[PDB]
Amino acid sequence: EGASGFYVQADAAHAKASSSLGSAKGFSPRISAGYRINDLRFAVDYTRYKNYKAPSTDFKLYSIGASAIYDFDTQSPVKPYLGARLSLNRASVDLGGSDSFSQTSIGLGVLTGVSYAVTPNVDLDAGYRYNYIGKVNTVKNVRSGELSAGVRVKF
Numbered sequence: 001e002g003a004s005g006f007y008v009q010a011d012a013a014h015a016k017a018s019s020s021l022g023s024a025k026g027f028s029p030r031i032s033a034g035y036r037i038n039d040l041r042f043a044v045d046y047t048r049y050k051n052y053k054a055p056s057t058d059f060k061l062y063s064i065g066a067s068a069i070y071d072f073d074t075q076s077p078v079k080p081y082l083g084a085r086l087s088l089n090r091a092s093v094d095l096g097g098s099d100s101f102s103q104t105s106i107g108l109g110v111l112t113g114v115s116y117a118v119t120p121n122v123d124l125d126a127g128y129r130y131n132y133i134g135k136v137n138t139v140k141n142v143r144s145g146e147l148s149a150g151v152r153v154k155f
Contacts, residue, residue, distance in 0.1 A: 005036040011125065011150030015049055017061060020140040026051040028146050034067075041069040041083075049144070060092040060099070061144070063131070067111060077117035085109040089133045089142075102137035115152070123152040 013028035026049055034043030049061035069083030087107035092099040113127030126149050133142040 001037060003035045003037050005154045006033075007035065007152055007154040008033050009043070009045075009125065009150050009152040011127070011148040013047075013129075013146040013148035015144055015146045017049060017142070017144045019142045024051050024055060028144075028148070030148065030150070032067075039070065039073075041067075041071060041081075043067045043069070058094060061089065061133075062092065063087045063089045063107065063133075065107075065109075069111065071115065079115045079117070079123075081111070081113055081115065083111040085111055085129065085131065087131060087133070089131075089136065091136045091139075105134050105136050105142075107131050107133040113148075121154050123154075125150045125152055 009032045011030040013030060015026050015028040017024050017026070028047055028049045030045050030047045032043045032045035034041055045065045045067065047063045047065065051058060065085045065087040067083050067085045069081050072080045087109065089105045089107045091102040109129055109131035111127060111129045113125060115123045115125045117123050127147070129146045129148070131144045133144065136142050
């Protein structure tokens, strides 16, 4: 109805990916862009997961997501939040030097966390995301948990 407080955010994340085959640990840098309407934040992000240590079959995970988030007001620069995320997900496996990708899978996740306002234009953000990514070319019940820390600049 009237958009405002456009912004960009970068996060670093410790992640755990799981499936019916097992689980693995790694890192999940994220970049997003967004804005506020009403008291809601909307954002698009690109995330890419890598293993710390490569299993016999190494892989990467990629998503592009759309998030809707509610920020709780307190009497303070500390602001809890709660949200939901829809995503398009792919996996990668290296094959003679080159990545080869899986089909695309729709994912559904929850996000929560806390922001701190450093100044009226800059926030720090400590978060948890959980994503149900489902079935990625053969492998079942793919899911991830991510703990993150980032910076948001509302230009």
